[PDB]
Amino acid sequence: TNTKGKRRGTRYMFSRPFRKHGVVPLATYMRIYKKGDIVDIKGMGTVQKGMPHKCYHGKTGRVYNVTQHAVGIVVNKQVKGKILAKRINVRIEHIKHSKSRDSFLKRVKENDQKKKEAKEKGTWVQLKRQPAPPREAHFVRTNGKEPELLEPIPYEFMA
Amino acid sequence: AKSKNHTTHNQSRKWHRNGIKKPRSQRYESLKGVDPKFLRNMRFAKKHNKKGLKKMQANNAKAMSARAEAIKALV
Amino acid sequence: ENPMRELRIRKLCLNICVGESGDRLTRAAKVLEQLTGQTPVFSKARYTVRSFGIRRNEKIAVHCTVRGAKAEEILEKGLKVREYELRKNNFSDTGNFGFGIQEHIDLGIKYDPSIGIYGLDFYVVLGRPGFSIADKKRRTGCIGAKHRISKEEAMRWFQQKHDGIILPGN
Amino acid sequence: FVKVVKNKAYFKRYQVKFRRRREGKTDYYARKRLVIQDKNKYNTPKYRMIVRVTNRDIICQIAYARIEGDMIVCAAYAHELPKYGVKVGLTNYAAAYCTGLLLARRLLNRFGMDKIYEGQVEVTGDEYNVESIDGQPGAFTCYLDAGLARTTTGNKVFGALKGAVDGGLSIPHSTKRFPGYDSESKEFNAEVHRKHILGQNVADYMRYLIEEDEDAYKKQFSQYIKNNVTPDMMEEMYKKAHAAIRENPVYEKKPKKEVKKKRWNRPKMSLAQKKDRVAQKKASFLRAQERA
Amino acid sequence: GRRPARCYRYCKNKPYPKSRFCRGVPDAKIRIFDLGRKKAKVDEFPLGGHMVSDEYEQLSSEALEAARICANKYMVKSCGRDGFHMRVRLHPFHVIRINKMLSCAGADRLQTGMRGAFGKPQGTVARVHIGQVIMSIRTKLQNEEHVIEALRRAKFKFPGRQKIHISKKWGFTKFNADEFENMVAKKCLIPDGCGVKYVPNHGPLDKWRVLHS
RNA sequence: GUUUCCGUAGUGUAGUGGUUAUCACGUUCGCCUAACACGCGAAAGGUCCCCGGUUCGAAACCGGGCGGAAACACCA
RNA sequence: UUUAUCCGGUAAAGCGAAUGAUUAGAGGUCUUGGGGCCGAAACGAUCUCAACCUAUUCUCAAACUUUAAAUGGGUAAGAAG
RNA sequence: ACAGAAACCUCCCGUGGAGCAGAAGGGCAAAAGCUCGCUUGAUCUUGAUUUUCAGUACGAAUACAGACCGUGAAAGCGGGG
RNA sequence: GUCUACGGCCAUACCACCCUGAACGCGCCCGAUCUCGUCUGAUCUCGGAAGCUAAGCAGGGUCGGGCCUGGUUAGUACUUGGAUGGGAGACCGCCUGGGAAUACCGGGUGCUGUAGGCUU
Ligand SMILES: [Mg+2]
Ligand SMILES: [Mg+2]
Ligand SMILES: [Mg+2]
Ligand SMILES: [Mg+2]
Ligand SMILES: [Mg+2]
Ligand SMILES: [Mg+2]
Ligand SMILES: [Mg+2]
Ligand SMILES: [Mg+2]
Ligand SMILES: [Mg+2]
């Protein structure tokens, strides 16, 4: 049997990456979070107060609370089946803004724009994304060379 | 009388037979867990919305008649 | 011609190591007191050694740092006991130098049958204007590449202010 | 010989410090403590009053911290004080007052508040603490930033703070280290702050070092003998600045456009100009030593 | 003494290197990984003969022992005591274990069977991959056949199979042998006793100034 | 193989809690004796088994090993 | 499953990158030694072996790591916008 | 100077090779290390959440809020390590 | 062109040495009356303005070490799936997809934020 300890096996997880042991860069606690914002937890060794727990390391969740230097945040945690939407309290040093959201809200700001315009025209524009289509028959042109002849090369034991 | 000591063998089958359910989320989730100084204030904000309903109602008819004028000036 | 490369004394250090911790040390504290004019600090032991009779955090020596004008006045009246002559390996790689004396009465000091004869350790940290860059608090820095006092630059310092005869052979 | 400490491996594993600590300028712990705002606010800035008595001039400036680099809302230097009749001694504790007084008034004329919270007027050197006015805009608040100054009693950094507090800024300050605090009875004289604020620590030095000997005078302060400053006058130099600063604080920065734009830096040498310097040597080496 | 090499032939368990975590290891049997004239120069021994493994297996310390000796003996011979250099390129590094021989006296009364099955160190063993070299010899280009036969005899002290191969390098370096003389004059390569130092167009110019001077 | 116990002067053995090392014998030198004993005075002698760690400091406190010893290996 | 986007320290790799092992020579009175041989002795000469280190080289690590996959885990792809 | 591989003093190099009561593992440099001065946030009081998990306790922990304070120019930090 | 004050990302910024810095500043620097601190005005605190770019700092320079990025190593090592494929076995080949790391070669060497200067 193994030990239930809160920081078991994190020997390699919470470890500051490389050539970064030291002062936390001050930007990381001067960006703002407000309820609704989506956040990806990523623990960190230097700050021990308010750490998450290793099963949330790498997970995302939205924000529901904001205290003086921590953020209440709801993530999903799968347990033997049933997924429990549970809310944890994590100090800011272990948190980033997830740009996972931000591809859309840029497809949105552009979709809303491309619909307000081209509405004075009435021309229906492709608003939906659409997966990578078949590559659309074209030409190839060799100019004045035949292709280069390739031959499988004779084996020889290198060692 | 030795026995098997553990396994997660067909467990994936079992808890996926009723199809692991992402927790059904409604709008308007509970405020339980938010810091008291927020609520202890936002309840006073909510409790006295009505004191100041006269401003809200007349100022609503102002924009309602200014945009009944904006949609009629278009006509 | 050198604007300010005036090789001058930054400090003069005195040390009386007497691994005895009490009398023979409380009396040696008046020697540097009388000779300099400033209360000397009591040093203590780094850790215990058996064969020497010293214990951890037990007081061993008493030392002093004299700078400014009174540092030239004890470096002078220092040598002239060694009669203005030193050895090649006293001028270190870093531009300092040091000479021990054997008896503290030959420095113009009154001898008592109680207050015995403890020689001391003269060491002299040569400097140059702009050396406190290392020691300050805001915006510290390293002292260039030149502007550092070499073993040979500190040699002919002493050959040109106290006219030493610095003698070769270990 | 020895083992070479600075190996190839020393530099491969060596992680540099944060730059502003290489230059030895920034205490970021005590900047993390000072600057970051609580996330019950999420946008409202946290102002600091910065004072860096340099070597010759006392800089004052108020800043909040953004993520691109803290922006400066208002800066007031000590080398602008000659406009208000202070010619000399502008790294001295008396002048850090006028700098911090200027800074406070030049900040309070924007946001239209120069007509309220003027703070102490004449001068006392006592406990003053602006109390925001009901029905009016709340008083301005910031927190003194000492930087790297060992803040023992009398040090000008939080002595320039007394200038801002007298100007109308609500900065939480004690008096435990204002010049005048008696570190053996734990109280105030408050008439020692009288002198130090108006320069009588420099006047009474200017009066001991006149009767005792000359030529120490005129070497300790020549530009105080030149420019026709004297004792019995210094107190009535800063008492005019304290009034002249507070009637017009606004800056009128001098216009600037003349420069012909020459380059007396030295440019970076291109690739091929290094690439031939070798092969410009090694033809001077070869040719030379294939003779003798 | 020791179980036959059968039981410890395959690489089953993760490497068990001698460290603070296993101790009391009996010192490896093979000790001297190179003999002959290891005081040779690169300029006088141009024949990199190899003995390359063809199977992913283990080699006992005592096997590398006999394989070296029996090659020292068909060498200094036809070659002479000076005319070669032999390298063993597998240091027995991984520690092999033995449950404690299930020792019993008489018929028996008890042994506990498997409780604490974990056993003691018994010896050491080399890990070998396909296409990885075991032994390498270098002599004069004159003496090729005697490298082939000296390595051919060492195969018979080894389990599994291994091909004998003559390298295109010069002696023990990494440099293709058709190119050595060219990279020696003009000094892309500088003799360094056995090996050789590849000097690039990288360093300070004075480092050159020594050469071509 | 499992579980215990020790190692200290030439020898057998004390000893402490982490600041010191004993006793007895042996031995060396004198003294008595005609000469040995006996007796009386003085003497010199051990990394405190080999190790690494903890500690201000280990002979003594831990961990490993080496040597000498003791106690279990029952139901068929 | 795509499209974005974070998370990861396993296989492999590396050890002329840390830690830990480890072979060889060249280089070094580095230091120093313990033996020598030629020396009264002498960093004198020549060796030698030890330990270190200056460029190198052979081979390794489950309780080592500069690097670093594959499979894989989060979210997000709107009207509760 | 006595002083030797070790006492004491001085300069230079020193990314951490030390230290952080203990096992290891992480973390740490005008620090979390060492030295001083002032102290009792190791105090009183509701809830919320994390950790083992049935998503029960106990233990331990994380964010708050309300009091009384300690400290510091202050921002802050502190309800054991 | 550049600096000073406060910075962000934290080596393309470090380190080693070499050369050049007009004016503003930054500094070295000169003193201990007061404030404050020391065994020592050495550091810290304070009053200064006689000197100098000697150094820090800035700017460059090095077939420089380091880092940052590309190429190669290599479609190699490894791997998701697949077969009544091979092999006594170790292991190996192919199909369907993904795809690294050194040594070895190149290129680069701090970008900027706000507020103030100087080159008027
Ligand atoms: Mg069974
Ligand atoms: Mg501070
Ligand atoms: Mg793992
Ligand atoms: Mg509280
Ligand atoms: Mg603590
Ligand atoms: Mg001075
Ligand atoms: Mg300069
Ligand atoms: Mg210069
Ligand atoms: Mg380079």
Nearest to A100 by CA among A52, A40, A145, A26: A40
Phi, psi of A84 (to 5 degrees): -105, 120
Nearest to E135 by CA among E34, E60, E206: E34
Nearest to E95 by CA among E127, E65, E63: E127
Instruction: Report the alpha-carbon distance of residue A95 to residue A73 in Å, rounded.
Output: 10
CB B36 under 7 Å to nucleic chain H:
yes
The alpha carbons of chain A give a radius of gyration, in whole angstroms, of 26
E212, D286: Cβ pair inside 8 Å?
yes
Asked whether the beta carbons of A72 and A66 are under 8 A apart, the reply is yes
The amino acid that residue C76 corresponds to is: E
Compute the nearest-CA separation of D1 from chain E (Å): 20
Q: How far is the CA of E96 from the C1' of G12 (A)?
A: 25
Instruction: Report the alpha-carbon distance of residue D76 to residue D51 in Å, rounded.
Output: 10
Sign of the CA dihedral running C95, C144, D17, A68: positive
Rounded (10°) CA dihedral C87, C91, C92, C98: 90
The amino acid that residue D266 corresponds to is: R
Subunits in contact with chain E (3 or more CB pairs closer than 8 Å): A, D
Helix residue ranges, H only, D231-270: 235-244
Q: How far is the CA of C106 from the C1' of H7 (A)?
A: 26
Asked whether the beta carbons of C166 and C86 are under 8 A apart, the reply is yes
Ligand with minimal distance to A8 CA:
3
Instruction: Report the alpha-carbon distance of residue C139 to residue D26 in Å, rounded.
Output: 10
Phi, psi of A64 (to 5 degrees): -130, -10
Q: How far is the CA of B22 from the C1' of I6 (A)?
A: 49
Minimum CA–CA partner of C133 in chain D:
D24
Burial, A154: exposed, middle or buried (Cβ in 10 Å; 0-12, 13-18, 19+)?
exposed
Nearest to E34 by CA among E94, E88, E81, E77: E88
Task: List Cα–Cα distances, C20 to A41, A49, C16, D229, in angstroms.
Answer: 62, 50, 11, 61
A157, E50: Cβ pair inside 8 Å?
no
Q: Does E202 touch chain D (CB under 8 A)?
A: no
Asked whether the beta carbons of A22 and D18 are under 8 A apart, the reply is yes
Residues 6+ apart with CB under 8 A from E148: E49, E164, E166
Burial code (b: 16+ CB inside 10 Å, e: under 16) for C24-50 equals: ebebbbebbeebbeeebeeeebeeeee
**Pairing, β D58-64 against β D71-76:** antiparallel
Question: What would the two tokens of residue C23 be?
Answer: 């009398």
Ligand with minimal distance to D32 CA:
2
Task: List Cα–Cα distances, B11 to A34, B74, D49, in angstroms.
Answer: 39, 66, 63
Helix residue ranges, H only, chain E: 61-74, 144-154, 180-184, 205-210
B34, A65: Cβ pair inside 8 Å?
yes
Q: Is D262 left (phi over 0), alpha (psi -120 to 50) or beta?
A: beta
Chain A positions in Cβ-Cβ contact with residue E52 (cut-off 8 Å): 157, 159
Burial, A98: exposed, middle or buried (Cβ in 10 Å; 0-12, 13-18, 19+)?
middle
Burial, D283: exposed, middle or buried (Cβ in 10 Å; 0-12, 13-18, 19+)?
exposed
Asked whether the beta carbons of A127 and A119 are under 8 A apart, the reply is no
Minimum CA–CA partner of D37 in chain A:
A30
Instruction: Report the alpha-carbon distance of residue A68 to residue B35 in Å, rounded.
Output: 10
Instruction: Report the alpha-carbon distance of residue D161 to residue D128 in Å, rounded.
Output: 12
Task: Write down which residues 49-88 in C have CB closer than 7 A to strand H.
Answer: 49, 51-54, 60-61, 63, 65
Q: Which nucleotide comes closest to A27 if you measure CA to C1'?
A: I8
Chain E positions in Cβ-Cβ contact with residue A156 (cut-off 8 Å): none
Instruction: Report the alpha-carbon distance of residue E146 to residue E44 in Å, rounded.
Output: 17
CA closest to C1' of H48 belongs to B33
Compute the distance from residue C130 Cα to the ligand 8 centre, in Å.
13
Asked whether the beta carbons of E88 and E64 are under 8 A apart, the reply is yes
- DSSP state string for C19-85: TTSSTTTTTHHHHHHHHHSSPPEEEE-SS-BTTTTB-TT-EEEEEEEE-SHHHHHHHBTTBTSS-S-
Asked whether the beta carbons of D117 and D165 are under 8 A apart, the reply is no
Sign of the CA dihedral running C151, C152, C158, C164: positive
B11, A76: Cβ pair inside 8 Å?
no
Ligand with minimal distance to B2 CA:
1
Instruction: Report the alpha-carbon distance of residue D60 to residue D145 in Å, rounded.
Output: 10
Chain C positions in Cβ-Cβ contact with residue D25 (cut-off 8 Å): 138-139
| E strand map for chain D | 48-53, 58-64, 71-76, 140-141, 143-145, 169-170
Question: What would the two tokens of residue B8 be?
Answer: 């997660």
**Pairing, β E85-88 against β E133-138:** antiparallel
Q: How many Å from the N-terminal Cα to the C-terminal Cα in chain D?
A: 35
Minimum CA–CA partner of A157 in chain E:
E165
Task: List Cα–Cα distances, E147 to A157, D107, E38, E88, E130, in angstroms.
Answer: 18, 92, 16, 14, 22
Instruction: Report the alpha-carbon distance of residue E204 to residue D163 in Å, rounded.
Output: 58
CB C102 under 7 Å to nucleic chain H:
yes
D278, E205: Cβ pair inside 8 Å?
yes
Instruction: Report the alpha-carbon distance of residue A96 to residue C61 in Å, rounded.
Output: 57
Task: List Cα–Cα distances, A103 to A33, A98, A106, B13, D129, in angstroms.
Answer: 19, 10, 6, 35, 51
Instruction: Report the alpha-carbon distance of residue D291 to residue D284 in Å, rounded.
Output: 12
CB atoms within 10 A of CB E11: 15
Instruction: Report the alpha-carbon distance of residue E100 to residue A43 in Å, rounded.
Output: 46
Task: List Cα–Cα distances, E46 to A83, A158, C34, E86, E169, in angstroms.
Answer: 69, 18, 80, 13, 8
Helix residue ranges, H only, chain D: 8-13, 19-22, 32-35, 93-109, 157-167, 192-198, 200-211, 235-244, 271-277, 284-289
Strand partners, E96: E123
Nearest to E79 by CA among E155, E137, E157: E137
B29, A64: Cβ pair inside 8 Å?
yes
Asked whether the beta carbons of C97 and C126 are under 8 A apart, the reply is yes
Ligand with minimal distance to C146 CA:
8
Question: What would the two tokens of residue D22 be?
Answer: 């290489």
Collapse the DSSP code of D187 into the 3-class scheme (helix H, G, I; strand E, B; otherwise coil) and give the result. Answer: coil
Nearest to D240 by CA among D114, D104, D94, D112: D94
Chain I nucleotides close to protein (CB under 7 A) are 1-2, 4-11, 13-18, 22, 25-31, 33-37, 39-57, 59-67, 89-92, 104-110, 112-120
User: Residue C66: how many CA atoms within 13 Å on its side-chain side?
Assistant: 25
Instruction: Report the alpha-carbon distance of residue D137 to residue D149 in Å, rounded.
Output: 33
Chain C positions in Cβ-Cβ contact with residue D52 (cut-off 8 Å): none
Chains A and E touching, counted as 3 or more CB pairs less than 8 Å apart: yes
User: Residue D166: how many CA atoms within 13 Å on its side-chain side?
Assistant: 26
Task: Write down which residues 117-156 in A have CB closer than 7 A to strand G.
Answer: 129, 131-132
Phi, psi of C43 (to 5 degrees): -80, 170
**Pairing, β D140-141 against β D169-170:** parallel
To one decimal, the resolution in angstroms is 3.7
Burial, A10: exposed, middle or buried (Cβ in 10 Å; 0-12, 13-18, 19+)?
middle
Asked whether the beta carbons of D169 and D113 are under 8 A apart, the reply is no
Phi, psi of B38 (to 5 degrees): -70, -60
Chain length of chain E: 213
B23: nearest CB among A67, A81, A85: A85
Strand partners, E198: E189
Rounded (10°) CA dihedral D115, D119, D124, D125: -140
Collapse the DSSP code of E108 into the 3-class scheme (helix H, G, I; strand E, B; otherwise coil) and give the result. Answer: coil
Chain F nucleotides close to protein (CB under 7 A) are 1, 56-57, 64-65, 73-76
Task: List Cα–Cα distances, D39 to A69, A96, D46, in angstroms.
Answer: 6, 14, 12
Burial code (b: 16+ CB inside 10 Å, e: under 16) for C151-164 equals: eebbbebbeeeeeb
Q: Which of D2, D21, D23 to mutate to test the interface with C (most CBs of C within 10 A)?
A: D23
Chain D positions in Cβ-Cβ contact with residue A26 (cut-off 8 Å): 28, 31-32, 35-36, 65
Question: What would the two tokens of residue B69 be?
Answer: 């004028």
D15: nearest CB among A19, A25, A32: A19
User: Residue C60: how many CA atoms within 13 Å on its side-chain side?
Assistant: 15
Nearest to C104 by CA among C146, C64, C140: C64
Burial code (b: 16+ CB inside 10 Å, e: under 16) for D145-174 equals: bbbebeeeebbbbbbbbbbbbbbbbbbebe
Compute the nearest-CA separation of D7 from chain C (Å): 20
Total H helices, total E strands in chain E: 4, 10
Chains D and E touching, counted as 3 or more CB pairs less than 8 Å apart: yes
C137, D150: Cβ pair inside 8 Å?
yes
Minimum CA–CA partner of E208 in chain D:
D282
Asked whether the beta carbons of A98 and A39 are under 8 A apart, the reply is yes
Phi, psi of E61 (to 5 degrees): -55, -40
Phi, psi of D129 (to 5 degrees): -155, 110
Instruction: Report the alpha-carbon distance of residue D201 to residue D94 in Å, rounded.
Output: 9
Angle at D190 between CA D185 and CA D194, to 5 degrees: 140
Instruction: Report the alpha-carbon distance of residue A153 to residue A142 in Å, rounded.
Output: 25
**Pairing, β D143-145 against β D48-53:** parallel
Total H helices, total E strands in chain D: 10, 6
Phi, psi of E46 (to 5 degrees): -95, 65
Name the DSSP class of E43.
G
Chain E positions in Cβ-Cβ contact with residue D282 (cut-off 8 Å): 205, 208
Strand partners, E196: E191
Asked whether the beta carbons of A14 and A56 are under 8 A apart, the reply is no
Subunits in contact with chain C (3 or more CB pairs closer than 8 Å): D
Asked whether the beta carbons of E183 and E175 are under 8 A apart, the reply is yes
Task: List Cα–Cα distances, D260 to D214, D257, D263, in angstroms.
Answer: 49, 9, 10
Ligand with minimal distance to D274 CA:
9
Question: What would the two tokens of residue C156 be?
Answer: 């002919």
D281: nearest CB among E205, E212, E213: E205
Name the DSSP class of E176.
B
Could you identify the residue written with the tokens 């070479």?
Answer: D4
Rounded (10°) CA dihedral D129, D133, D136, D137: 30
- DSSP state string for B16-75: TTTT-PPP-PPSS---TTS-HHHHHHHHHHHHTSSTTHHHHHHHHHHHHHHHHHHHHHH-
Compute the nearest-CA separation of A109 from chain E (Å): 53
- Give, for E51, the enclosing helix (H) or strand (E): strand E49-53
CB atoms within 10 A of CB D63: 21
Residues 6+ apart with CB under 8 A from A44: A14, A16, A24, A51, A93, A94
Instruction: Report the alpha-carbon distance of residue D92 to residue D193 in Å, rounded.
Output: 14
User: Residue C39: how many CA atoms within 13 Å on its side-chain side?
Assistant: 1
